[PDB]
Amino acid sequence: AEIGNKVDLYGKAVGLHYFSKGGENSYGGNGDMTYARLGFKGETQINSDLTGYGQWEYNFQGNNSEGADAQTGNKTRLAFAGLKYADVGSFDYGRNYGVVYDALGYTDMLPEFGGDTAYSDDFFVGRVGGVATYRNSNFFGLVDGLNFAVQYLGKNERDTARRSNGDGVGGSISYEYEGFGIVGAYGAADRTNLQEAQPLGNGKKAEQWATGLKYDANNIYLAANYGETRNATPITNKFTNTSGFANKTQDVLLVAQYQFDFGLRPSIAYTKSKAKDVEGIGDVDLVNYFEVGATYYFNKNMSTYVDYIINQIDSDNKLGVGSDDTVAVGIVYQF
Amino acid sequence: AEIGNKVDLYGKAVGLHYFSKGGENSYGGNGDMTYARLGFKGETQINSDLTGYGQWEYNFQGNNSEGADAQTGNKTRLAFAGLKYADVGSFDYGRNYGVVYDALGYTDMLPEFGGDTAYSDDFFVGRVGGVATYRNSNFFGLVDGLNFAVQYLGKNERDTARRSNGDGVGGSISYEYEGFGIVGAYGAADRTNLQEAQPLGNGKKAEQWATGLKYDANNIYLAANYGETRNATPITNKFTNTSGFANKTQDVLLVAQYQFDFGLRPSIAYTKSKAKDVEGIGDVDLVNYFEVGATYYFNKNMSTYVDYIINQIDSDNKLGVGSDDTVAVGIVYQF
Amino acid sequence: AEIGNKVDLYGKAVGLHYFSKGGENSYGGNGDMTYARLGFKGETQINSDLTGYGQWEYNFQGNNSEGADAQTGNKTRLAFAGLKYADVGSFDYGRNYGVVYDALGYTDMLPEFGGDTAYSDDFFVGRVGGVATYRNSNFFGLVDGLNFAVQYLGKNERDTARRSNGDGVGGSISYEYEGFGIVGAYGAADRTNLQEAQPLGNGKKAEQWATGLKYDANNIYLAANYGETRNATPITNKFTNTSGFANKTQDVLLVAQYQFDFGLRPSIAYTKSKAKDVEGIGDVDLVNYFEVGATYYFNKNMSTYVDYIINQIDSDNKLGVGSDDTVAVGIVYQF
Ligand SMILES: [Br-]
Ligand SMILES: [Br-]
Ligand SMILES: [Br-]
Ligand SMILES: [Br-]
Ligand SMILES: [Br-]
Ligand SMILES: [Br-]
Ligand SMILES: [Br-]
Ligand SMILES: [Br-]
Ligand SMILES: [Br-]
Ligand SMILES: [Br-]
Ligand SMILES: [Br-]
Ligand SMILES: [Br-]
Ligand SMILES: [Br-]
Ligand SMILES: [Br-]
Ligand SMILES: [Br-]
Ligand SMILES: [Br-]
Ligand SMILES: [Br-]
Ligand SMILES: [Br-]
Ligand SMILES: [Mg+2]
Structure with missing residues (x-):
C-alpha cells in the first residue's frame, strides 16, 4: 500500500496448513506452513524520458518457534x-528473477503449488543473485507486443553446490497479440568446481530453455510450457544420501483456470519433469502430478484457497521422490 | 501509524538496561537489553457483515553485535x-496467542517484567505456532459482556522438547460488567515423543488452566490470576544440566496500578509459581517475587520506566533459580 | 519517506558489484555486494521544550542465496x-554511533569505501551497543557553533574479543563557523578478559582519539582527520591465523570533493592507518591507499557510482593485508 517519487511498502500474512499422510513420503509435507512477506517497491520520475526504481522483498517464516530455530527459512527474495529510459529499455542489477522465468511464469499461477521447475538460485529459472537484466518492450517502440530481454549472470562461489553458479548469459523473446502470448527463453553458464565434484551431473556448463504458450482473456487463463535443462536442475538420491544435478531433464507444465465475477477462481493443472541419464539409475521422474484447486477472492486484500496435488509419482521412484498427495489450505491478508 | 482497507505499520525502539549484582544469579540478568519491534496490522471491509484482517510482528534485538551473534533473539512474534463475520464470530489461523493467555493477560501489565507463566511456545499460555482460533463477543450479540473462544492447536514436531507440541484444544469464557471482568480458560494437548524422553516431567498429556479477576475503571487497575499446569511448564535443573517439564505447578499473580492524569503510572505486584513432584527434588519455587515500578507517559509515542523486582527466591533453591533482584530502566519511542 | 508525531519509514536498494583480480588478495574483494536497508525514524513533540524520538535501521544482505547462508551479514545497525529538551541537550540510550565517530564522520564521505578506521563494535569509533549519549548544540544556546557531547559505554561481554568491550567514557567538542568546522573527540574503556587473552595487543585499557578539520561550502567539501588508538583497533595475522588488537595505531584520512549542479560529485581521497608494536612483527600498515571516484545524482531518490581504490599496500605486508585494487559500481534507489 503506497506509502515525483512513488514508493510503496507491501506485504501479506498467510495462514497456511498442509495435509499429507504421516509428510515424509509426500509431495508437499505435513503441518503448519504459515509465513509472511514484506517489501517495498518504488519508482521515481527523473525526467520525461527517465524513471529510476527499486524493489526489496523478504520472507518471514511463521511456523518456527521463538527459540533457536527462529530464522529457519527467512530470506530476502528480491x-x-x-533505470528505465524512454523507448531504449530498462536495466537493473541485484537479486532478481532469472530470464528463463520469463517463460516458466506462464504456468506458475496455482493457488499454492505449481512452478516446480523454477528453482531458486538455479541459474536462470528462478530468483538468483548477481544478475544484470536488460528488458525491452515493443522493440524500442517499433513493434507493439514484441518484447525481449537479455541477462548477465555473475559467478556466485558459495559454500554449497546447490546455491552456486558460474558466469553465464541468458535471454528471452516474446510476442503477445489479443489475449494470446508466445515466449521463448534460453541461458547457459559455467558450473563451479564445487558443482563438478558432486556425484550427480556431468559437464562443465549448464543450460536451461523453455517455451511458453498462453491464452489470457475473457476470464479464461490457459497456458503451457515445455523445456529442458542440461546439468542445471538440482537432485538428491535420498537412498544413498547423494546430491548434485541431473544430466538432462525434460519438463511439461499445463494450467487451466477460470475467473468468476463473484471471486471464485478454479484451477486445474498438470506438471511433469523427468531427469535423464542420472548416474547409476538412468531415467527418473522428479515431478509428476495433476492439480485441482481454487481461490476465493473476497476482495483485493483478502482470499482463501485450497490446493490439491494428485501425485502420480509411483511408490518405487528410484531417487526416493515421495508419492502421497498433499492438500493446502490458506488464508491471506495482503496490502 | 496507519499507513475500504485500513493497514497500519507499527513499531517501537526500546532503549533498555538491566541492573543486577554480578547477573548469573539474578531474576532478570545484567546489562544492555535494547531491542526494537516492527509489524503491520490491517483490516479490510469485505461487506457490511464481513471484515478480513491480518497481523505480523517481529522482534529485532538491539544488544547483539554486527558480527556472528547478530541474529540472537530475533524472531517473528505473530x-x-x-475473517470476522457479523455476530457469528472471528476465525484466524497462524502464530498467535494461545487461549489460556486470555486469562494470564489480566496480570501481564507490568512495565518490564511480570507475566512469568505465559511462556512462548508452551501449549496455550503464550504465543505459539499453528493455532486456529474462534472468538465470540457478546454471545452472538445476545448477551452483552459474555465472550468465549475455542482454539485448535496443531502438532509442532520441532528439534527441541521445549518448543514442540502435540495436537490439543483449549478454550476460554469471560464476563465483564461495569469495570469488573471475570475469566476462565483451559486447554489440553498431546506431548511429543521428544518431550516424553526428557528426565523432568512424567505423562502423555499436558493441561493448563487459569482463572482471572480484575477491576479496570476510574484510573485503577487491580487484577488477579490463579492457575495450574500438568506436564506443561518448562524447567531446568541447572545443577545437573537436566531439562524438561514440571509434573505440576501452582501459580499466583497479583497486580495493582493507578493512572495519574500527568502520566505517572505506578505499579505494585506479586508473583509466585511453584513446581511440584519434580523428579529427584519434590516441590520447588520457580518464581517468587514482589514488584515495584512505574511508567511515565509523556504522550502516546513516548514513555520511560523503571521496574524493580524484589526477588523472594531463596539462595538455596534446589534447581538453581537465581536469587538477586533486578532493576530495569527503559526509554520507549513507539508509533 | 514520511509515513504531533512525525514518523518516517525509510530505506534503499543498492545494486552493487566489486571488481578485483582473482578478490582474496584485494582491498575490497570481488563479486556481488548487493544489499538493502530499512529503518524508521520518528520524533514526537511532547511540549514546546521537549521532543521524544527513536530510530531503528537494519541491513539486509542481497548477495546470499535463499538457502542456509541466507542470513549472512544481516544485522541491526541502529x-x-x-529525549531532547529545550536548550539543555539531548539524551539517548541503545545501539548508536560512538562519540569518536563525531570526528571520523568528516572523512567518511566516499561513494563506497573510506571511513576505514570507524570499525563497528569497536569502542567509540563506530556503531556500538549499550551507549548513553548526551549531546549539546550551541553550548546551551549561549555560543553559536560550539557543540559538545559525552557518552557512556556499558560493558558488553560477548563470545568474541573483536565484538566485546568493558565500561568506558568518551566525549567530543566541535566548533563550526562559516563553512569551516573543527572537531576533537576522545574515549577510553576497560578491555575484557577475553580481549586480554588474545596474542595481539597488550594492556588493560583502550583509547581512541581523533581530530577533524573540514571546509563544507560553495559546493566544495574538504576534510582531514588524524587520530591514534591504543589497544583498540582489531587486527589479524593471516599468516599464523592470529587475531587481537594493535598496541598502537596512527591514522590519517583525507578527502576532496566537488558538487556540480547537474548531479556529478567527483571524489578524491587518501587514507593511511599504521599499527605499531604489533607483537612479533613491529610496525605494519593496515590501510594505505588513494581513491578516485564519483557519484551521479539523478535526483534525491536515485544515483549511481564508481569508486576506485588505488591500493598502496605492498605485496609483502607482514600481516597479509591484500595489495590489489578494487573498483565498485553501484546503483541506488532510496526513499
Ligand atoms: Br521464529
Ligand atoms: Br518458485
Ligand atoms: Br528450491
Ligand atoms: Br543470491
Ligand atoms: Br521495455
Ligand atoms: Br479449470
Ligand atoms: Br546485531
Ligand atoms: Br511473554
Ligand atoms: Br520462554
Ligand atoms: Br511457532
Ligand atoms: Br466476537
Ligand atoms: Br500501586
Ligand atoms: Br538470502
Ligand atoms: Br563504517
Ligand atoms: Br568492522
Ligand atoms: Br551492539
Ligand atoms: Br543540542
Ligand atoms: Br576531487
Ligand atoms: Mg534477520
Missing part, C-alpha cells in the same frame, strides 16, 4: 534497482 | 490472518 | 531512543 533486492535490485535500475 | 503472523496470522482471519 | 536502535535507540531519547
